[PDB]
């Protein structure tokens, strides 16, 4: 199937470089002109740069004229954006995004790459329970972390259905925190076993919590 | 450069009727030499990147269901969705590809008018562990509710707390279309063991009248 694999993201001082990369696959990539696309967060879409299918013409978004570089390697099928100077403002997932063979709109798009210009610490978060006391509430709090992304599952992806993972909010300390619950019979209490699988790939930190009704 | 401006920013329509979202570009997109508009209907999923719905201003993405169709020339666009179903919560983007460059407009959230529902409130301590680093996170729960808007008060020993907490809301649920919130009361470990009854407080129209859960520190 058509593909579009973002990689090179993440957190990266202002003024410094980042290079990000974008594995196409399941069509003839030389044939098709490629874009990059960015979304801070919590707002709205902005194209960034634009490449022919050759790599002879390119174009660029004012904001990213002079510092952005796209570029691409039809014999590895590969789409890159060099980007340099990089200000708070460039903070954003940056999607790599394909133009149809002969219309010219972007038909597909990747999953994007998180890029977050900082100079913020990279730092992995503590995880606490949220302990239940029909129905009953249990959860995980992944408190102090930076920068974003985290994942978190429950019993390795077994347990899905009634699971709430809340948006991240920035403390004032400027450290993300977030909590993730599930409802679940309160029968199941004393028999299933709860466990949120917490990953935060940027600090290298990975935590299994078990979760249970806290003992008197 | 191409402005392109939707309308509304915010939709809320019931299941099964029909949302329209209009779009208006700065200059005329329609290209002379083929007799096409250069504007594209997309939808937008939280944790997904867009998708395509529409091009040439009418015409529909393979795969994609009839229910949605665009329509318009030159400046002035409309996206109908008819027979809107609960999985179609998204934020709607219109985008002109007539000339670089590329242009999207500032988005339209449609969300879904469904009946009231009240939450279901959940409360919980801070951790023991957390404690020994000395810092007590207490959390409030709202589960399943609609509408968005809720009131949630906390209260240590009578006092309301107010600065100290932060909440965070779901994306309204594509099967269920409600919305759950948290809300996280944060102080010292100090200022934890000073005060005995910690209380969230919850007003929503689905509740006939507040709806409190507590618990007093140290006690089961």
């Known amino acids: 199937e058509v593909q579009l694999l973002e990689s090179g993201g993440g957190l990266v001082q202002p003024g410094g470089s980042l290079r990000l990369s974008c594995a196409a696959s399941?069509?003839?990539?030389?044939?098709?002109?490629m874009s990059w696309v960015r979304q801070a967060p919590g707002k709205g879409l902005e194209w960034v740069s634009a490449?022919?299918?050759?790599?002879?013409?390119?174009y660029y978004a004012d904001s990213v004229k002079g510092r952005f570089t796209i570029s691409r390697d039809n014999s590895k099928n590969t789409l890159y954006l060099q980007m340099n100077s990089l200000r708070a403002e460039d903070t954003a997932v940056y999607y790599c995004?394909?133009?149809?063979?002969?219309?010219?709109?972007?038909?597909?798009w990747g999953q994007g790459t998180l890029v977050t210009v900082s100079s913020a610490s990279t730092k992995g978060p503590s995880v606490f329970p949220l302990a239940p006391s029909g129905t009953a509430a249990l959860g995980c709090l992944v408190k102090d972390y930076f920068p974003e992304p985290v994942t978190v599952s429950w019993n390795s992806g077994a347990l899905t259905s009634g699971v709430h993972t809340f948006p991240a909010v920035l403390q004032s300390s400027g450290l993300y925190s977030l909590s993730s619950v599930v409802t679940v019979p309160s029968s199941s209490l004393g028999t299933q076993t709860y466990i949120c699988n917490v990953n935060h790939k940027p600090s290298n930190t990975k935590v299994d919590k078990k979760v249970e009704p806290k003992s008197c | 450069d191409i402005v392109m401006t939707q309308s509304p920013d915010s939709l809320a329509v019931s299941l099964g009727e029909r949302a329209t979202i209009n779009c208006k570009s700065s200059?005329?997109?329609?290209?002379?030499?083929?007799?096409?508009?250069?504007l594209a209907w997309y939808q937008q999923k939280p944790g997904q990147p867009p998708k395509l719905l529409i091009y040439?201003?009418?015409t529909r993405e393979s795969g994609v269901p009839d229910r949605f169709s665009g329509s318009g020339s030159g400046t002035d666009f409309t996206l109908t969705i008819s027979s809107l179903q609960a999985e179609d919560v998204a934020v709607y983007y219109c985008?002109?590809?007539?000339?670089?460059?590329?242009?999207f407009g500032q988005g339209t959230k449609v969300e879904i008018k469904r009946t009231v529902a009240a939450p279901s409130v959940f409360i919980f301590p801070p951790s023991d562990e957390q404690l020994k680093s000395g810092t007590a996170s207490v959390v409030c729960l709202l589960n399943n509710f609609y509408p968005r808007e809720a009131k949630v008060q906390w209260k240590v020993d009578n006092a309301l707390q107010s600065g100290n907490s932060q909440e965070s809301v779901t994306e309204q649920d594509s099967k269920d279309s409600t919305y759950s919130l948290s809300s996280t009361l944060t102080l010292s470990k100090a200022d934890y063991e000073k005060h005995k009854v910690y209380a969230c407080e919850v007003t929503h129209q689905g509740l006939s009248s507040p709806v409190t859960k507590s618990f007093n520190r140290g006690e089961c």
């Open positions: 995004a394909k133009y149809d063979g002969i219309y010219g709109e972007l038909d597909f």
């Open positions: 399941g069509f003839t990539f030389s044939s098709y002109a």
């Open positions: 490449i022919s299918g050759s790599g002879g013409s390119t």
């Open positions: 200059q005329s997109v329609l290209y002379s030499s083929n007799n096409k508009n250069y």
């Open positions: 040439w201003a009418s």
């Open positions: 985008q002109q590809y007539y000339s670089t460059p590329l242009t």
